[PDB]
UniProtKB/TrEMBL annotation, chain A:
This is Major capsid protein. The chain holds residues 55 to 107 of 319 of the full protein. It comes from the Viruses. It comes from Escherichia phage FCWL1.
Automatic annotation (TrEMBL), chain B:
It comes from the Viruses. The lineage of its organism: Viruses, Duplodnaviria, Heunggongvirae, Uroviricota, Caudoviricetes. It comes from Escherichia phage FCWL1. This is Decoration protein.
Amino acid sequence: SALRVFPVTTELSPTDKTFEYMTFDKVGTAQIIADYTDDLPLVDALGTSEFGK
Amino acid sequence: QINASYQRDMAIALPGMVADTSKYNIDGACVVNEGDVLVGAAVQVVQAQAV
């Protein structure tokens, strides 16, 4: 029942040995401020990948 | 008769005023915890929140 319970997709070519997929993320924050403010928080981002056979 | 002309000079500063445009730094993310603060007087830090 494996092929009827879990989905089956066709993206790989017959000549491929490996594949890869990626994921992303982010961070950040905010604050209550006043006028004449010189310091402010900052934000960034990330990334990751995984493989197969 | 004889006319008169006068001259007055303004004051140069007020309490709590920035003197020059040289390199400075201001922290705007600050909260008054207890009492009132006089513009022109030093302050102190009670605690800095971690998060």
